[PDB]
């Protein structure tokens, strides 16, 4: 059963998204023929629309897609359950900038105060184990499921929890609900794979093998799970015009070499 969204902010967030949509750019995505990954670091891929070859920033397209899916499928998200437990208190240890413990505990306090809202509007289940006022024993039970067969990379998860309390302004309905959808999409976008010198002998065989694995995993996600979804439901907003570049016009290339 699909839930009724009588929220004024969600209808206003939809109008802003509907107006931003550019038909010419969406006509390129609807008829895309994904070629492959061009740059794992800058997040660039290649698609063919008609007889033209394009250069796509898939990170940007994925950002807008997972932002769009969230707005459409509002409070109707699935649940992703996590032998291996992940604690939010231990997750924030990555930031050395927050030297104070009470400052680290201030972030967790904003999330638990909104735990009922996060699980009902965004399917983010958060359950405590210790005392009611205790912040050390606070975990994350489940994350929303936007795309079937797509499991978001949890490398960016400590930044998501950090930015959910720090960046997201919980003092305005529209700006708060926009902020959370913008935060989930950032977590949902496939990670960048930084380039490593394969020809350099100063690097170990594991470092070189794992980088290859990261490269092959990104291409598999893009070909099998991500780009089919983009060709199906992606609606391209005008600001993505900068992230869709023409690199080749293929009939201009037939001229260079004719049938032998």
């Amino acid at each position: 059963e699909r839930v009724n969204v009588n929220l004024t902010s969600i209808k206003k967030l939809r109008e802003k998204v509907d107006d931003s949509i550019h038909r010419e750019l969406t006509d390129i995505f609807a008829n895309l023929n994904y070629v492959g990954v061009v740059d794992e670091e800058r997040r660039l891929a290649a698609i063919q629309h008609d007889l033209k070859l394009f250069l796509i920033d898939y990170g940007s397209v994925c950002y807008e897609l997972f932002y769009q899916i969230g707005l459409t499928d509002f409070a109707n998200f699935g649940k992703i359950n996590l032998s291996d437990d992940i604690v939010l208190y231990n997750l924030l240890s990555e930031f050395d900038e927050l030297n104070d413990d009470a400052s680290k505990e201030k972030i967790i306090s904003k999330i638990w105060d909104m735990s009922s809202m996060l699980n009902e509007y965004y399917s983010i289940e958060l359950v405590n184990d210790g005392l009611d006022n205790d912040l050390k024993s606070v975990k994350l039970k489940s994350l929303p499921l936007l795309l079937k067969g797509y499991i978001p990379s949890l490398v960016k998860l400590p930044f998501f929890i950090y930015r959910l309390g720090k960046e997201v302004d919980w003092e305005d309905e529209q700006e708060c609900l926009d902020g959370i959808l913008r935060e989930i999409a950032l977590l949902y976008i496939p990670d960048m794979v930084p380039k490593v010198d394969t020809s350099d002998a100063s690097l170990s065989e594991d470092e070189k093998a794992q980088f290859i694995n990261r490269k092959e995993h990104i291409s598999s996600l893009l070909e099998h799970v991500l780009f089919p979804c983009i060709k199906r439901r992606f609606l391209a907003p005008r600001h993505i015009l900068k992230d869709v570049v023409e690199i080749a016009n293929l009939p201009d290339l037939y001229k260079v070499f004719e049938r032998c």
Partner: protein
């Protein structure tokens, strides 16, 4: 110069016509579309030129015995064949000059035997074409007093008739436009293309790739 291509990674096939390839340390090198036919034609040709020249240089070139083939020639034409007789032997073209005069072709290489097909008029033209090529310093004689082998060191000394024959064989055996190539088949094409002597042009001299970046 050629070592730039060795630093290229295959992306995938584009429009069943091209193979899109991608290249830090970018000194005249990001995206290139390699013509699939020209790529296969090039790999195939260099294999055919290697086969022919290794055969010729090691004296293992097949020379099928031709029966009753006498061709009428001019006095100067007869002299031109009497001169370069030894040269034509290196290609399996074994003939004897009679005496107005007549050229008695005793043997022919299996490819030339096929292309000639009983056309004495075509065969005369093809031998005259090479005799004149040698004579006018357009083509050098095959020096075999060298006793590994690099076919491209002797490539310039191959008669045009053979060159033509090898180019058409390469083109015919090669992959065509509209043909389905898997990412693996492309990895292999570009792997071998980067191991070519001239990977930047096809058999018929046309460019095998155009960078798009």
């Amino acid at each position: 110069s050629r070592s730039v291509l060795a630093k290229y990674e295959v992306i995938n096939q584009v429009d069943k016509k091209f193979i899109l390839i991608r290249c830090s340390i970018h000194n005249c090198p990001l995206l290139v579309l390699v013509d699939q036919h020209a790529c296969d034609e090039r790999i195939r040709l260099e294999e055919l030129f290697y086969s022919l020249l290794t055969e010729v240089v090691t004296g293992t070139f097949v020379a099928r015995d031709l029966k009753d083939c006498c061709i009428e020639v001019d006095r100067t034409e007869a002299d031109l064949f009497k001169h370069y007789q030894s040269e034509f032997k290196k290609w399996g073209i074994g003939y004897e000059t009679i005496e107005t005069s007549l050229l008695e072709i005793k043997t022919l290489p299996e490819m030339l035997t096929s292309k000639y097909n009983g056309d004495k008029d075509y065969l005369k033209m093809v031998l005259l074409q090479h005799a004149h090529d040698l004579k006018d310093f357009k083509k050098l004689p095959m020096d075999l007093s060298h006793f590994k082998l690099y076919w491209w060191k002797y490539s310039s000394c191959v008669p045009t008739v053979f060159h033509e024959i090898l180019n058409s064989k390469a083109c015919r055996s090669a992959v065509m436009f509209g043909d389905e190539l898997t990412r693996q088949e492309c990895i292999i094409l570009i792997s071998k293309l980067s191991r070519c002597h001239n990977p930047f042009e096809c058999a018929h001299g046309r460019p095998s790739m155009v960078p798009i970046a």
